[PDB]
RNA sequence: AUUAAGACAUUCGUGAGUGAUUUAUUUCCAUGAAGUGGCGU
């Protein structure tokens, strides 16, 4: 298969700077680089360089010389648009 | 006065007719709006 369509659960609230949109959800700008780093670390059995050579051999890298990025497309969309919005501070107030 | 004399290689005639500088090509690739709390044991 060429597509992975995962449904994920929220356990603790996310602090979001672009909250003014009702479609605000997980930003793949954080997920994709960290997921690439994690995937390559697992590929090399704990070593990032070995995983990079692994992805280099299997042609999974966008670039084989410069960066850590893997070739796939990440999309995160809200199914139901209802949001529970929290105020987060350091002290307790009435 | 002599196998001599006389006679513009000249007249007319469009370098013209037909014809896309067009076809193909992602302004894209990488990238965390994030980090930290401090003060009177």
From TrEMBL:
Full-protein interval shown: 1 to 94 of 469
This protein's name: Uncharacterized protein
Domain of life: Bacteria
């Amino acid at each position: 298969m060429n597509q992975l369509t995962a449904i994920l659960k929220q356990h603790t609230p996310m602090i979001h700077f672009q909250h003014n949109e009702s479609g605000a959800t997980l930003r793949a700008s954080e997920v994709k680089p960290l997921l690439d780093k994690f995937i390559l670390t697992k590929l090399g059995n704990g070593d990032i360089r070995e995983g990079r050579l692994y992805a280099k051999k299997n042609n999974w890298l966008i670039d084989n010389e410069k960066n850590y990025a893997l070739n796939y497309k990440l999309s995160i969309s809200l199914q139901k648009k209802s949001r529970l919005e929290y105020l987060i501070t350091s002290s307790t107030f009435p």
